Design a protein around this ligand. Structure first.
Ligand code: NAD
Ligand code: NAD
Ligand code: ORN
Ligand code: ORN
Ligand code: NA
Ligand code: NA
Lengths: 339, 340
């Protein structure tokens, strides 16, 4: 079993570059989504608590199995901890052997930005150039760069209740001269006249970050922040006024923005759109919404990507997580006599 | 986050002792089973393949969250790999922070033996002295010692289709002079006149290791080997002649021996027996069956036990699995500039 810890992932991402990492991952995600029906899918298992949730996100095909452990505690930042922390494993289906154990906190931000990018490439109007970024925390820089470097976004209007978060975002990306990022005094001000609205706020409760009055013809909404029951960012009527796209419907019906609508509210499966079998955006005036909550297949993709890229660079360290090949695999007792 | 790998767990178990480890764990398991209602329980999630299964087993209470990754591939031994491999994590509920990452292959054998022991103490006749052990692989030595050291079993009659497995079992426990382990040439021969039958065979299919004609009044069956849909060890009629006990009913209805019986077939929750809310064994002549498939609470208990035992010994290695406290927890992007 190989292990990629936080500093090693940092070196890997730094080497590949955040922009290329996101672009290459989006391409890999698109191919895996097209192969949707080849995967053994399931809604992630969630263990809710008073201030957060801890989830396990498994998925697999005929040769590889993958899963991610991840928590979502919005109040963590008040204690100097990340709202989102994660790690995962890529394993061999025919033996059950865990080939890679990897940090996935940094990787989650990367796959989430890549997934949002993939969805936008297929759903947003091709002439998009301005985006509103509501929520300027951990996910924000990644979302900003994904859209700037791969979807032609030149101007971002940002807003966060915490002004220091916005300052951080602007400072982190100032080095990208082709991108202008400016602070707005409110959500309504930030979203005025934008082609794309990305929401990545963290608040474990029902919230109406985006209301019907803010919608303009042709907009694409990248709703990422809400991702579990009782945690939303869009007013229910925003969804009723748009064509809604999802990752894994069974899971999104419960955790996504659509949890606020009748169980029969029509949504479109993103993988069908990517295969060109179902219509995505139907007109230039239409409002499209990517009701994103995160799905195990995305973690499977980033885990496979990380393994391949780390191997090529000889990065990672071996760990004795489980027994390897032994003379007598039925003699587990031999391990009780000491190393 | 601290990490306990295979060799470290080996040293830890060696220092505690297999029998003591099992005994202390059984006591800890009893306490956790008693507060069964305090846990957020769920049936484990499984991913099935043609040769095996890979499962995630989570459980949590108000303070701790735990989960185990584990596979079950009966054909692995032909490739010199273990049929069962596992690892898990114990985390803080109010922050989601993973405190311990630990190997759980060795630990699984220990908690399974402890669970079987705990069940047997409440279900088997208190005067049991002889046990049949069908399947002499990885789990066998642990099951053998649990019963010998904590349930007064002085004699074990063992059988395995692989004669080298039985030889391994006998040689491994020869040092325990108070325990006699003899090889039988068939399952029928091995179970004749025993007080307890422990089955830990590995075969991904519907097997009738134990048939009705083998049953004798007063027996307790510790059915451990079968643990998923389509994988059983007992003939359905064996269950019809017994009082059947389970771990987490919703999960066992799907994966246990009872998957072969009506959805309405009566079963008894082991935790309720331990709480004294319902009976375990009701008569000396009764046949009791612990339909064991494994449940996340057991892994939660062993993870907590391992953490405690490792801490007082200063064992375990720090690993950077996830970020810890930082000046600005909202600046994850700073981690993309390299470790330097
Ligand atoms: N859809 C997915 O795949 C996916 C994966 C990434 C994370 N998540 C979700 O993304 C959200 C953000 O994650 P993060 O790591 O950036 O968290 P974070 O805590 O680092 O940042 C969230 C930011 O939102 C701001 N915020 C909270 N309420 C607000 C409001 N009403 N208006 C404006 N700003 C507000 C906070 O001040 C904070 O800076 C979380 O809710 C998380 O669960 C989803
Ligand atoms: N209930 C639980 O909590 C729990 C936890 C431990 C493992 N499991 C199950 O326990 C079983 C055994 O695990 P292990 O690690 O010892 O595996 P193992 O492969 O090391 O040993 C199993 C043994 O069974 C023998 N066997 C197979 N078919 C047989 C038959 N028809 N008659 C007699 N012997 C036969 C094999 O030759 C082998 O030596 C597996 O099926 C596993 O999934 C259950
Ligand atoms: N707070 C993070 C929760 C998990 C997230 N929805 C994901 O898909 O990773
Ligand atoms: N094939 C998966 C086996 C896992 C075992 N039943 C356990 O409870 O650990
Ligand atoms: Na969302
Ligand atoms: Na069983």
């Amino acid at each position: 079993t190989y292990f990629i810890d936080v500093p090693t992932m940092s070196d890997l991402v730094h080497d590949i570059g955040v922009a290329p990492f996101i672009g290459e991952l989006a391409a890999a995600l698109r191919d895996d989504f097209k192969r949707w029906q080849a995967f053994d899918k399931s809604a992630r298992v969630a263990s809710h608590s008073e201030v957060g949730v801890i989830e396990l996100m498994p998925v697999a095909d005929k040769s590889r199995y993958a899963f991610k452990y991840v928590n979502g505690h919005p109040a963590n930042t008040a204690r100097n901890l990340h709202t989102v922390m994660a790690f995962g494993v890529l394993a061999d289906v025919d033996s059950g052997y865990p080939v890679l154990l990897s940090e996935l906190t940094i990787a989650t931000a990367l796959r989430t930005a890549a997934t949002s990018l993939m969805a936008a490439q297929a759903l947003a109007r091709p002439n998009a150039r301005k985006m509103a970024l509501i929520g300027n925390g951990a996910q924000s820089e990644f979302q900003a760069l994904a859209f700037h470097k791969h979807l032609g976004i030149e101007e971002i209007v940002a807003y966060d209740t915490d002004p220091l978060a916005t300052a951080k975002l602007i400072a982190n990306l100032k080095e990208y001269s082709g991108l202008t990022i400016r602070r707005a005094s409110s959500v309504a001000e930030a979203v005025k006249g934008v082609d794309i609205i990305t929401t990545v706020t963290a608040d474990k409760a029902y919230a109406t970050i985006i209301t019907p009055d803010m919608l303009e013809p042709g907009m694409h909404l990248n709703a990422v922040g809400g991702d579990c029951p009782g945690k939303t960012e869009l007013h229910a009527d925003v969804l009723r006024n748009a064509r809604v796209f999802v990752e894994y419907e069974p899971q999104t019906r419960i955790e996504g923005e659509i949890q606020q609508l009748p169980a029969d509210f029509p949504v479109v499966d993103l993988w069908r759109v990517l295969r060109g079998e179902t219509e995505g955006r139907q007109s230039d005036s239409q409002v499209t919404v990517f009701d994103s909550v995160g799905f195990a297949l995305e973690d499977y993709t980033v885990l496979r990507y990380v393994l391949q890229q780390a191997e090529k660079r000889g990065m990672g360290t071996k760990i004795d997580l489980v027994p390897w090949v032994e003379d007598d695999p039925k003699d587990l007792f031999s391990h009780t006599r000491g190393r």
